[PDB]
PDB file of C-alpha atoms and ligand atoms in Angstrom:
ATOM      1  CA  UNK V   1     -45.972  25.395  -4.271  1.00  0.00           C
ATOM      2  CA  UNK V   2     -44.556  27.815  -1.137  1.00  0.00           C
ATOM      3  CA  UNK V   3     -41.789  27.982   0.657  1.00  0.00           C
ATOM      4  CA  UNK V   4     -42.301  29.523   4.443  1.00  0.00           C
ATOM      5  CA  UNK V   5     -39.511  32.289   5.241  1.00  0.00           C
ATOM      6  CA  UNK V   6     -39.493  34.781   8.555  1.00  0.00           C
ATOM      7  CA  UNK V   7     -39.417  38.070   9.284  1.00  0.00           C
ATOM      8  CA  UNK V   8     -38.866  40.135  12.665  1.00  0.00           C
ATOM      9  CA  UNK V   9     -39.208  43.273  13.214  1.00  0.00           C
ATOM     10  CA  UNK V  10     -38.242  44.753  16.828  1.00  0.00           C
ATOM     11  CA  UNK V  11     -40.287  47.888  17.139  1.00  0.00           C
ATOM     12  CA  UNK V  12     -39.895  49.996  19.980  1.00  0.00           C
ATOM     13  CA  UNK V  13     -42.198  53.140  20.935  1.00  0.00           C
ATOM     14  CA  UNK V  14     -39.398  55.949  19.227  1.00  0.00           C
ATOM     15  CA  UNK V  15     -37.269  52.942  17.182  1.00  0.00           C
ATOM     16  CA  UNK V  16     -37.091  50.049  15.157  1.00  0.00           C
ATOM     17  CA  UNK V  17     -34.270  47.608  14.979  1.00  0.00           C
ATOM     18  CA  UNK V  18     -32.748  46.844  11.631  1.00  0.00           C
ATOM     19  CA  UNK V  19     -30.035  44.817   9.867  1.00  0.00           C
ATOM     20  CA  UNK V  20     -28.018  45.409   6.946  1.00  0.00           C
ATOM     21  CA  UNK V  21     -27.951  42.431   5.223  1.00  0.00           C
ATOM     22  CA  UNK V  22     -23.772  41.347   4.687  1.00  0.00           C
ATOM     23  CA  UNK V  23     -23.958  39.050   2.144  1.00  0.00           C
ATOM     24  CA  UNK V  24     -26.271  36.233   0.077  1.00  0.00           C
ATOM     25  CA  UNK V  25     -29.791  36.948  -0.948  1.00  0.00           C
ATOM     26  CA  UNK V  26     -31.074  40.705  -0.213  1.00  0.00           C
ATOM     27  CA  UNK V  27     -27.608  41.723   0.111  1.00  0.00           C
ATOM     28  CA  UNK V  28     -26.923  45.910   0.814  1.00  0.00           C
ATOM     29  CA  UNK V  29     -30.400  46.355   1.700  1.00  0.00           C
ATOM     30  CA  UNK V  30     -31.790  46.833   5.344  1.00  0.00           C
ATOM     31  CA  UNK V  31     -34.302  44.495   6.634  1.00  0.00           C
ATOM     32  CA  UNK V  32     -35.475  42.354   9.574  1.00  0.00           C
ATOM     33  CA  UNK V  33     -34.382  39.556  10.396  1.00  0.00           C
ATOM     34  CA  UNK V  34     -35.169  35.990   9.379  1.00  0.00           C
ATOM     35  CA  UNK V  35     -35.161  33.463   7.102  1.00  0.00           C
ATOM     36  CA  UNK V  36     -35.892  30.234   5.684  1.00  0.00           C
ATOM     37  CA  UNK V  37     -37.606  27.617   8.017  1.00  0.00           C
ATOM     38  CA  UNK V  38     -35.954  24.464   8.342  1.00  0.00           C
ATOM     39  CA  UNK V  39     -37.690  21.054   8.485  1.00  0.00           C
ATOM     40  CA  UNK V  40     -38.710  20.065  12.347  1.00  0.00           C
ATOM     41  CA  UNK V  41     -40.071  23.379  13.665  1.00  0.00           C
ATOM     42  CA  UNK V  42     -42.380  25.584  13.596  1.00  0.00           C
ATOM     43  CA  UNK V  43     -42.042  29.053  11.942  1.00  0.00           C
ATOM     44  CA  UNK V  44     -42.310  31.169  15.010  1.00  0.00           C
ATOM     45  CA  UNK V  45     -39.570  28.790  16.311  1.00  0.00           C
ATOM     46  CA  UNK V  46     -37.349  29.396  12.969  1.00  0.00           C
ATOM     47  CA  UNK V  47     -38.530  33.241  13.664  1.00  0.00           C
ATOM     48  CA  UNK V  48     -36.652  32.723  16.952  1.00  0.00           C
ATOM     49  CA  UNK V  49     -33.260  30.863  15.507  1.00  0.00           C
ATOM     50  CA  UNK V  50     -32.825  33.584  12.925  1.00  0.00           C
ATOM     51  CA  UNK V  51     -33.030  36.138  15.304  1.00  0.00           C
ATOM     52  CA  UNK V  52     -30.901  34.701  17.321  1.00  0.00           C
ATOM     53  CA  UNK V  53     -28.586  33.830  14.570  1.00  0.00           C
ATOM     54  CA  UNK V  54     -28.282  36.839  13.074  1.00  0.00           C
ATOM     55  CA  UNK V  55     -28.235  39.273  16.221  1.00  0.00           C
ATOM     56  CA  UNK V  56     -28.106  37.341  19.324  1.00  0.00           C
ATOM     57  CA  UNK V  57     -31.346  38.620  20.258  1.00  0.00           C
ATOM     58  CA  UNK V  58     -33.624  36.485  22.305  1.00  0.00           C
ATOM     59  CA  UNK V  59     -37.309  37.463  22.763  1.00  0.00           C
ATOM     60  CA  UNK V  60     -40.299  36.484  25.010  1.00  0.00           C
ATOM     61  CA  UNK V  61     -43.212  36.866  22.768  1.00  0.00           C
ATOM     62  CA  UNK V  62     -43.210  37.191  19.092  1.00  0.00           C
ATOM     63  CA  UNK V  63     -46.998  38.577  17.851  1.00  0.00           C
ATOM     64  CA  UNK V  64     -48.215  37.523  14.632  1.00  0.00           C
ATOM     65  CA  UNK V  65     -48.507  40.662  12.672  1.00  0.00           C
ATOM     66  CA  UNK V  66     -48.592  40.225   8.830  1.00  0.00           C
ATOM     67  CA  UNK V  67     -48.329  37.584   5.832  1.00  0.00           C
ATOM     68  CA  UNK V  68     -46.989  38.505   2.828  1.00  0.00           C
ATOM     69  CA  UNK V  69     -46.871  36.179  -0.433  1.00  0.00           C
ATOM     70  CA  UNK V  70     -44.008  37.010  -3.293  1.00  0.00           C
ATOM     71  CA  UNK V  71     -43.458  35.623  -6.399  1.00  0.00           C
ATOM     72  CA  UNK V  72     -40.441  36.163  -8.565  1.00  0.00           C
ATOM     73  CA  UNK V  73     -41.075  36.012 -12.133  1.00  0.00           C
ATOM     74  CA  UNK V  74     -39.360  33.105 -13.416  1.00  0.00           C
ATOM     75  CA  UNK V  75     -39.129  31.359  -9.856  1.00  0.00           C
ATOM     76  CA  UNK V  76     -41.628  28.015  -8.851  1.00  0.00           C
ATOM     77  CA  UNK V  77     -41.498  28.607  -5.285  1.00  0.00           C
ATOM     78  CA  UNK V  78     -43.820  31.559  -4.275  1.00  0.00           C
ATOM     79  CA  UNK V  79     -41.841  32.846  -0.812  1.00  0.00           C
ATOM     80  CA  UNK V  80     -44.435  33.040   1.925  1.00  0.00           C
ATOM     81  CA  UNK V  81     -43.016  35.448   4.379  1.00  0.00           C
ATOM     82  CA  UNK V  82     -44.716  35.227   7.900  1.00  0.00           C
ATOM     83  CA  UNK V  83     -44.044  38.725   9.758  1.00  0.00           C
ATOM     84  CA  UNK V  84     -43.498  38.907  13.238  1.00  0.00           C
ATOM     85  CA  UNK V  85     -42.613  41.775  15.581  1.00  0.00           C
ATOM     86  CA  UNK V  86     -42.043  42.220  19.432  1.00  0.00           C
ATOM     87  CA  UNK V  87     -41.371  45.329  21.922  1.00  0.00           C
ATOM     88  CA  UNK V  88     -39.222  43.278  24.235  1.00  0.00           C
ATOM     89  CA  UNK V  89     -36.027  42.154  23.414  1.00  0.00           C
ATOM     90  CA  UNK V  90     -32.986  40.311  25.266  1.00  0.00           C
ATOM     91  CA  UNK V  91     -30.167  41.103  25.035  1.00  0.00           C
ATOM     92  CA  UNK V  92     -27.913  43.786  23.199  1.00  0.00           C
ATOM     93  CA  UNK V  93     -28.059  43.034  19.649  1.00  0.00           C
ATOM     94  CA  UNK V  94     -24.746  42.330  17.871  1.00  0.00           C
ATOM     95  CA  UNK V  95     -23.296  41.699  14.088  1.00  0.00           C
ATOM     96  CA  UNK V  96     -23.628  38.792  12.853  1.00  0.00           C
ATOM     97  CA  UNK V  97     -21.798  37.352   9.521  1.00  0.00           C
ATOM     98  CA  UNK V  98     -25.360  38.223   8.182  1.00  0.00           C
ATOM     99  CA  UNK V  99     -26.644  40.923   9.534  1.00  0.00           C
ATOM    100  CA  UNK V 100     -25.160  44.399  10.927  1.00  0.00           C
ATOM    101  CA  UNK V 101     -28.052  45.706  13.156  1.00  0.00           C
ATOM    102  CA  UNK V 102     -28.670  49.592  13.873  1.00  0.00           C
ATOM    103  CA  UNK V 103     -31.978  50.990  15.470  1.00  0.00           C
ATOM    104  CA  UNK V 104     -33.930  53.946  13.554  1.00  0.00           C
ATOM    105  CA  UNK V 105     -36.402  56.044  14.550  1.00  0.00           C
ATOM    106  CA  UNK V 106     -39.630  55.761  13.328  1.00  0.00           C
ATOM    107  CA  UNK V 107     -39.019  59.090  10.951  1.00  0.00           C
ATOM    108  CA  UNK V 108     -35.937  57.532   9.144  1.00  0.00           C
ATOM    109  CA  UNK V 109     -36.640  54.289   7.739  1.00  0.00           C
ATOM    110  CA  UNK V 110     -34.391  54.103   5.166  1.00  0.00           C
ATOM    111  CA  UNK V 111     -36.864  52.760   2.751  1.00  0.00           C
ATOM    112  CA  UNK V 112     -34.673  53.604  -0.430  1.00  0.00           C
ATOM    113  CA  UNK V 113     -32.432  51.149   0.709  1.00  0.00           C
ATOM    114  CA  UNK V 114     -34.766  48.358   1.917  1.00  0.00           C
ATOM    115  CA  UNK V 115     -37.455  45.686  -0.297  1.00  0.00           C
ATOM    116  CA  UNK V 116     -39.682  48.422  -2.616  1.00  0.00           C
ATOM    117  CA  UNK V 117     -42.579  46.501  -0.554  1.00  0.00           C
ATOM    118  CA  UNK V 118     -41.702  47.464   2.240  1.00  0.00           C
ATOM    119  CA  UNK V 119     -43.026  50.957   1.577  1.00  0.00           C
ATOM    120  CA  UNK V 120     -46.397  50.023   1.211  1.00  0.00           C
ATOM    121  CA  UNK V 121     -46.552  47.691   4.002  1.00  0.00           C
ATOM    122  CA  UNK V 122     -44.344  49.293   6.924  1.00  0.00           C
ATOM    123  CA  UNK V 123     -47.022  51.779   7.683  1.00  0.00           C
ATOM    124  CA  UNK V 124     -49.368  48.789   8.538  1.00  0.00           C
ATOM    125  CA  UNK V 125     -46.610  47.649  10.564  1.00  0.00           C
ATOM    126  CA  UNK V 126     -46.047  51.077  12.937  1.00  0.00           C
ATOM    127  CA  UNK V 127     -49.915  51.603  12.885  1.00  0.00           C
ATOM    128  CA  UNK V 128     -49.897  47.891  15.197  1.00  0.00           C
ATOM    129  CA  UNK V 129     -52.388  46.534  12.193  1.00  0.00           C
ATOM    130  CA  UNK V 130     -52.377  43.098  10.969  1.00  0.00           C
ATOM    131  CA  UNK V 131     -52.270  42.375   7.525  1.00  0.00           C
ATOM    132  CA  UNK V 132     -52.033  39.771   4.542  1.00  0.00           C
ATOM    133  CA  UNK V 133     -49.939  41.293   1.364  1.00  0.00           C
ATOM    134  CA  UNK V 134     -49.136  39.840  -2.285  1.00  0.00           C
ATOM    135  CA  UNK V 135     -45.525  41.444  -4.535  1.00  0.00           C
ATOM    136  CA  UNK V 136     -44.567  40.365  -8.107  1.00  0.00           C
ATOM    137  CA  UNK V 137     -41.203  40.857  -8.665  1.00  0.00           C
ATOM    138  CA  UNK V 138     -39.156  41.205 -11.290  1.00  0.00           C
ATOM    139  CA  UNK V 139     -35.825  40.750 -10.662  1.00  0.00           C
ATOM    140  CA  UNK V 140     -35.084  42.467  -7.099  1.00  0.00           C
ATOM    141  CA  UNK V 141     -36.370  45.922  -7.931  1.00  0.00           C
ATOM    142  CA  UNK V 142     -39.370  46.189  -9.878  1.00  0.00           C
ATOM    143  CA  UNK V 143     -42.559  45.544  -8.346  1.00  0.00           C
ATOM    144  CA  UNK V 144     -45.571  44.334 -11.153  1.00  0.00           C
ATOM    145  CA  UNK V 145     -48.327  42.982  -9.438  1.00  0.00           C
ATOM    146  CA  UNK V 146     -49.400  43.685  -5.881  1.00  0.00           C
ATOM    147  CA  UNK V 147     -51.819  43.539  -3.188  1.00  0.00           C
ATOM    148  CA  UNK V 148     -52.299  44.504   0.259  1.00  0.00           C
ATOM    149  CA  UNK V 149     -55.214  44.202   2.769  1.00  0.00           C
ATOM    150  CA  UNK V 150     -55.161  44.390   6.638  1.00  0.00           C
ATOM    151  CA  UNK V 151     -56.724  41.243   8.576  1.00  0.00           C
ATOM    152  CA  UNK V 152     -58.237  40.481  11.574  1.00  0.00           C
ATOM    153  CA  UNK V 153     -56.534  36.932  12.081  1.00  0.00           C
ATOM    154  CA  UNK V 154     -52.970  36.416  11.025  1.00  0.00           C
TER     155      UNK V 154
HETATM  156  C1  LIG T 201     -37.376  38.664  -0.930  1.00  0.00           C
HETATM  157  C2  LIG T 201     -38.459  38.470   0.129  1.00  0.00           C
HETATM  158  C3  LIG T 201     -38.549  39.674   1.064  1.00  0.00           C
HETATM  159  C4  LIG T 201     -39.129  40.848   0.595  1.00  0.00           C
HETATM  160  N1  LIG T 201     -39.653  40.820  -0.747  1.00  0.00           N
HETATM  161  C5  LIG T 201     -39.137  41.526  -1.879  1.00  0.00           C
HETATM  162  N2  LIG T 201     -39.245  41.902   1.390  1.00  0.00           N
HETATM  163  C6  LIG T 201     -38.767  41.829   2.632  1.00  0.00           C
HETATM  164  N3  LIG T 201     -38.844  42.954   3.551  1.00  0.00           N
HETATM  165  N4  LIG T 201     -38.190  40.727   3.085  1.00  0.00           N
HETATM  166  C7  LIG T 201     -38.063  39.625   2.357  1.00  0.00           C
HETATM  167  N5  LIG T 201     -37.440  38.431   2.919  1.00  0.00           N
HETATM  168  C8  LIG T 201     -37.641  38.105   4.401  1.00  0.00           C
HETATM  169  C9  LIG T 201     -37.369  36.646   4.746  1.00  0.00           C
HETATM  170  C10 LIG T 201     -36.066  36.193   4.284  1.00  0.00           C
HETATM  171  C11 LIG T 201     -35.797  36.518   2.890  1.00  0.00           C
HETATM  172  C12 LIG T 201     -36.022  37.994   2.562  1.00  0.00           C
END
């Protein structure tokens, strides 16, 4: 079976917003923010609570923008990861316990210290396209299997 996580991603025209994750799973490693989703709502509302929860950011509109299936060799739970973004944020965002949140511009993604998929599927990201991706990992480093397509519907 699946487990449904989140992802966020605030991109701006020149920036992006990014956390460094403080502690638990993905730990040292920039990301978005997000997270599992609890029982009694839906994901775009657990998009909302770990935003909130890890930056005190608020948003108007999240936009469906990707899908991406892992699986972790050894694991029974494939993680499916619904990817959001927005422009417009409110609020300033803060540190959490989580999550220490810095913007970049588009140029310096630190990708060396972010998810290995997230080189192959940030590009869709910035180029506004929608798409539906698949990592095998093993461990937290080494990507075996993948696949990546861009979508028309979310
Ligand atoms: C491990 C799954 C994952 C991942 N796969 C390697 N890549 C990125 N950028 N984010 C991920 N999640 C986002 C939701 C919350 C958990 C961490």
């Amino acid at each position: 079976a699946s487990r449904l996580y989140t992802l966020v991603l605030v991109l701006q025209p020149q920036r992006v917003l990014l956390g460094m994750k403080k502690r638990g799973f993905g730990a040292g490693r920039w990301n978005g923010f997000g997270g599992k989703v609890q029982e009694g709502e839906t994901i775009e509302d657990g998009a909302r609570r770990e935003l909130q929860e890890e930056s005190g950011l608020t948003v108007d509109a999240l936009h469906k923008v990707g899908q991406i299936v892992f699986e972790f060799v050894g694991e029974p739970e494939l993680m499916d990861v619904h990817v959001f973004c927005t422009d417009s944020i409110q609020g300033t965002p803060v540190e959490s316990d989580e999550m220490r949140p810095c913007w970049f511009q588009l140029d310096q993604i630190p990708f060396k210290d972010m998810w290995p998929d997230d080189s192959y599927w940030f590009p869709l990201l910035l180029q506004k396209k929608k798409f539906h991706g698949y990592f095998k990992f093993q461990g937290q480093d080494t990507i075996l299997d993948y696949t990546l397509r861009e979508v028309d519907t979310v």
